[PDB]
C-alpha cells in the first residue's frame, strides 16, 4: 500500500537524519586524548582466597554492599553467600528452579533476588527473626527467560527477560509498575545507574537502549556491534557504559554523545565476552572472555595490562568491590577466586 | 584455633556444617539421569510425556531403581542459541517425530511441508557443538494412521526420488534411513530408533535400555578401560 511505503520512507529518512546528527558531533577520537598519559603498569594479581564448595557451573555473582560478602549462583540449585575474608559460608539457600542465570544482592543487605529460565523472580529475606532464609515475594508475568535483575531500592527491582521486554516492579504489591518495550532481539543484561534514575539494557539484536525510570519510555538507542551483547555496566562516572559482544569486541559508549568512544579487541582472541565490570576509578576494565581465562584491559587505552589465567573452564561472572580492593571471577569449574 | 576468638571458632564450625550439608546434598543428585526432551509441532510430545508420567517443565519418574528426570522446554519461544549450553551434560536427548505427518503443510508457506521441518530440526540437534558425544533417542509416533494414509496415497509427494512398492515396511525403512543419514559423526554419537507402541511398557523399556547402554559406555570411558 501507499501508506506503508510512505511510512517506511519516513522511517528511513529519520534514520538518515539521526545518522547525520550523530556523525556531525563526532569531531575527535578518544585515542588522541589518552595516548599522552602514562599507561598503567602490568597488573599482577594473585588468588588470595579460593571458594570451593560448588558442584556445578557458576552463572552469577554479586559483591555485597560492605565489600566483604558475596553471593554466587550454581546450576545444582544453590545460592551461597560467602565471607570473603575468611572463606566462611555465611548462608546456603536451596532453590526451586535449578536453571538460574542471574542473582542480585540488595543494597541494604536484607534481601537477595534470583531467577532464570522459569519466568519467575524470587526474593529471599536474610535478616529474619527465625534465623533462616525464606522467600518473601515471587514476581511473574514475563514470557521469556530472565537475563538480569537489579535492586533499585528496598521496594523496587528492575528485571530484563528473554521476551524482549523489561519490567520495573513493586515488591510490596507484586504487580508491574512499568513495562519497557521496543527491543527486537533477546535482552541479555541490564545495569542500574549510580544515581538510580536511568538504566541501559543490551539485546541480542546488537543494540542497547537507555531508558528513563520515572516516565518509562525508551530515551536513547545505541548501535555499532555485530552480534549478541552479553554484558553491560556503567562507568562509575555514570555518563558512560561498556558493552561486550560475542564477536570478540567490547565497546564504550557515552550517554551525552551517541558515538563509539573506544573498542577493545585483539586478533588472537576470537572468543566472546561473557562479563564486563569496572574498577573504582574507571582505569581498569575486567572483561571475562570464554577462552578458559579472564582478562584485564586498561579502560582508557584499549591495551591489556594483565591476565587472570587461573581457571580451567569458561569464566561466566566477574565482580568488583565498592571500595575496589578485591576482584572475584566465577567459572564453570565450580571454583570462585578472589584476586588482589 | 591459635588466633581465632570465641566467636570465630563457632563461625568455622558453621562453615564446616554448611560444607558437610552441601557434600551430602551434592551426591544425592549425581545418580539421576537428565533426559532433554525435544520435538516439533504435533509430533506427540504431550502423548509421550503422558506415556511415562509419574518456561521449563520438569518431570520426575522411576523405573527399576533408577530415577529419570525430563525437561520439556517446548514452551520457551526464545532464541535457542542463548540457553542451550545449560543442557551440555545431559545423558540422552529424546527426539519425537510423527511419521503419519508427511502430506500436511505448515501454515507459513504452502510449499513448505511438515516433514522437512522435522529433518531440519534433527540436523540442527544432531550436529550441535554442545552435543558432540551425546546420544539421541529417535521416536516415530502415530504409526496407526500412517498405514491408512499410505495405502490410498503414495508418499511420492514427500519423496519424489523414492522408488518403492508403496508399502508400509519399505516407506518406513526409507524414512528411517533418511533420518539417520543426517548424522555426521557416526563414531562418537549413537542414534537409536523406535516405533511407538500402544502400551507404555515398550517405550519405557526402550528408554531404559538406551540410557543403560549410554551409562555403561560412559563408565567404560571413565575407568580408562577403553
Amino acid at each position, epitope marked *: 500500500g501507499s501508506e506503508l511505503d510512505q511510512l517506511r520512507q519516513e522511517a528511513e529518512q529519520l534514520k538518515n537524519q539521526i545518522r547525520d546528527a550523530r556523525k556531525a558531533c563526532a569531531d575527535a577520537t578518544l585515542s588522541q586524548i589518552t595516548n599522552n598519559i602514562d599507561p598503567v603498569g602490568r597488573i599482577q594479581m594473585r588468588t588470595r582466597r579460593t571458594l570451593r564448595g560448588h558442584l556445578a557451573k557458576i552463572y552469577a555473582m554479586h559483591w555485597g554492599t560492605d565489600s566483604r560478602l558475596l553471593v554466587s549462583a550454581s546450576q545444582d540449585g544453590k545460592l551461597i553467600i560467602w565471607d570473603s575474608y575468611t572463606t566462611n559460608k555465611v548462608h546456603a539457600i536451596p532453590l526451586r528452579s535449578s536453571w538460574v542465570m542471574t542473582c542480585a544482592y540488595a543494597p541494604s543487605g536484607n534481601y537477595v533476588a534470583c531467577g532464570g529460565l522459569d519466568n519467575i523472580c524470587s526474593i529471599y529475606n536474610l535478616k529474619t527473626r527465625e534465623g533462616n532464609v525464606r522467600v518473601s515475594r515471587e514476581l511473574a508475568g514475563h514470557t521469556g527467560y530472565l537475563s538480569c535483575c537489579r535492586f533499585l531500592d528496598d521496594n523496587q527491582i528492575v528485571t530484563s527477560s528473554g521476551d524482549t521486554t523489561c519490567a520495573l516492579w513493586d515488591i510490596e504489591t507484586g504487580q508491574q509498575t512499568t513495562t519497557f518495550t521496543g527491543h527486537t532481539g533477546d535482552v541479555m543484561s541490564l545495569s542500574l545507574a549510580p544515581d538510580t534514575r536511568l538504566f541501559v539494557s543490551g539485546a541480542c539484536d546488537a543494540s542497547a537502549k537507555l531508558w528513563d525510570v520515572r516516565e518509562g519510555m525508551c530515551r536513547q538507542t545505541f548501535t555499532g556491534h555485530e552480534s549478541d551483547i552479553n554484558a553491560i555496566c556503567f562507568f562509575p562516572n555514570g555518563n558512560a557504559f561498556a558493552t561486550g559482544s560475542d564477536d570478540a569486541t567490547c565497546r564504550l559508549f557515552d550517554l551525552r554523545a551517541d558515538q563509539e568512544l573506544m573498542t577493545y579487541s585483539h586478533d588472537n582472541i576470537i572468543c566472546g565476552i561473557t562479563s564486563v565490570s569496572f574498577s573504582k576509578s574507571g582505569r581498569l576494565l575486567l572483561a571475562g572472555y570464554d577462552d578458559f581465562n579472564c582478562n584485564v584491559w586498561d579502560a582508557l587505552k584499549a591495551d591489556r595490562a594483565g591476565v587472570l589465567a587461573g581457571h580451567d573452564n569458561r569464566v561466566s561472572c566477574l565482580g568488583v568491590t565498592d571500595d575496589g580492593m578485591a576482584v572475584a571471577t566465577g567459572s564453570w569449574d565450580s571454583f570462585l577466586k578472589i584476586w588482589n | 584455633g591459635c588466633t581465632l576468638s570465641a*566467636e570465630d571458632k563457632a563461625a568455622v564450625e558453621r562453615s564446616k556444617m554448611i560444607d558437610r550439608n552441601l557434600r551430602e546434598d551434592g551426591e544425592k543428585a549425581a545418580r539421576e539421569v537428565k533426559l532433554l526432551l525435544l520435538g516439533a509441532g504435533e509430533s506427540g510430545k504431550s502423548t509421550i510425556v503422558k506415556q511415562m508420567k509419574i518456561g521449563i517443565v520438569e518431570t520426575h519418574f522411576t523405573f527399576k531403581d533408577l530415577h529419570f528426570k525430563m525437561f520439556d522446554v517446548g514452551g520457551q519461544r526464545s532464541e535457542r542459541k542463548k540457553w542451550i549450553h545449560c543442557f551440555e551434560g545431559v545423558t540422552a536427548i529424546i527426539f519425537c517425530v510423527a511419521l503419519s505427518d508427511y502430506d500436511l503443510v505448515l501454515a507459513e508457506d504452502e510449499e513448505m511441508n511438515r516433514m522437512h521441518e522435522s529433518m531440519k530440526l534433527f540436523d540442527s540437534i544432531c550436529n550441535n557443538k554442545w552435543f558432540t558425544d551425546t546420544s539421541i533417542i529417535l521416536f516415530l509416533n502415530k504409526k496407526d494412521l500412517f498405514e491408512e494414509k499410505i495405502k490410498k496415497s503414495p508418499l511420492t509427494i514427500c519423496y519424489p526420488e523414492y522408488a518403492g512398492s508403496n508399502t508400509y515396511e519399505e516407506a518406513a525403512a526409507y524414512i528411517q534411513c533418511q533420518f539417520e543419514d543426517l548424522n555426521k559423526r557416526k563414531d562418537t554419537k549413537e542414534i537409536y530408533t523406535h516405533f511407538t507402541c500402544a502400551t507404555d511398557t515398550k517405550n519405557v523399556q526402550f528408554v531404559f535400555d538406551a540410557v543403560t547402554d549410554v551409562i555403561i559406555k560412559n563408565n567404560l570411558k571413565d575407568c580408562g578401560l577403553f
Partner: single-chain antibody, 232 residues
C-alpha cells in the same frame, strides 16, 4: 520466637535435677545454646555452652565436671542435669540463644528463667556504681570496668550491655560494645575504648528503671559484672 524453661524447685542437699527448655518459633537446629545462673538478690553468672550440631561443649570452672548438657535437635529441646547439689546451687536460671556468623546479634533472646532452691586467669567484671536516683527527662551514664583488653585481634570488642526489670527477664541492649539490638528505642547508647566502658540513656521514662549489667565474651569463662540500679 519463645523459649519455655522448666525443672526447678525445692530440693534436698542430696539429689539430682535436670532443667529442660523447649524452643518454638524459630530454627533451633542452628542456634548455639547457653545457660545463665542468677543468685537471689545478687548478680548473675554463666553456667555452660553447647554449639550447633553438638560440636563443642564448655562449662563454668565453678562447678566444672558436675554438669551435663544435652541437646535434642528433632524436638528442639535442651537439658542440663546436675547431680550433687551444694548450698551455693540455689538460684534462678536463664537459657539464652545464640548464633555466630559475621553480622549476627548473639545473645538476643534470654528466655524467661526458672528458679531452683536447695534446702539447708579470668578477667574480672566489676561496676563501682550501684544505685543512682534519677527523674525522667535527664540523661544517665553508667561505667563498667575490666581487667584486660577486650579488643580482639580481628577488631571486635566483646561487651554486651543488657537490661533487667523487676519481674521481667533480661534483654539485649548493646552487643559488641557499639551496636544496638532490635526492638529497643534509639535512646540507649554505648561506646568505650580499652578498659573503661559506658552506657548512656538520653531521656528517661518509667520503663527504664531496673538493673543494668555488662558482660564480656573475649574468652571463656563468661564472667559477669555487678549490676547498677536505676530507681525512680
Amino acid at each position: 520466637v519463645q523459649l519455655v524453661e522448666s525443672g526447678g524447685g525445692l530440693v534436698q542437699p542430696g539429689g539430682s535435677r535436670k532443667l529442660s527448655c523447649s524452643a518454638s518459633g524459630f530454627a533451633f537446629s542452628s542456634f548455639g545454646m547457653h545457660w545463665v545462673r542468677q543468685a537471689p538478690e545478687k548478680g548473675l553468672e554463666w553456667v555452660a555452652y553447647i554449639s550447633s550440631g553438638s560440636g563443642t561443649i564448655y562449662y563454668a570452672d565453678t562447678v566444672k565436671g558436675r554438669f551435663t548438657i544435652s541437646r535434642d535437635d528433632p524436638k528442639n529441646t535442651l537439658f542440663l542435669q546436675m547431680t550433687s547439689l551444694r548450698s551455693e546451687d540455689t538460684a534462678m536460671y536463664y537459657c539464652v540463644r545464640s548464633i555466630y556468623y559475621y553480622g549476627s546479634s548473639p545473645f538476643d533472646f534470654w528466655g524467661q528463667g526458672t528458679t531452683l532452691t536447695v534446702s539447708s586467669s579470668d578477667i574480672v567484671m566489676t561496676q563501682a556504681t550501684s544505685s543512682v536516683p534519677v527523674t525522667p527527662g535527664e540523661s544517665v551514664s553508667i561505667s563498667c570496668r575490666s581487667s584486660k583488653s577486650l579488643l580482639h585481634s580481628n577488631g571486635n570488642t566483646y561487651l554486651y550491655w543488657f537490661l533487667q526489670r523487676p519481674g521481667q527477664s533480661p534483654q539485649l541492649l548493646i552487643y559488641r560494645m557499639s551496636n544496638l539490638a532490635s526492638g529497643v528505642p534509639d535512646r540507649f547508647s554505648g561506646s568505650g575504648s580499652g578498659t573503661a566502658f559506658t552506657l548512656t540513656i538520653s531521656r528517661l521514662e518509667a520503663e527504664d528503671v531496673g538493673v543494668y549489667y555488662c558482660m564480656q565474651h573475649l574468652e571463656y569463662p563468661l564472667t559477669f559484672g555487678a549490676g547498677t540500679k536505676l530507681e525512680l
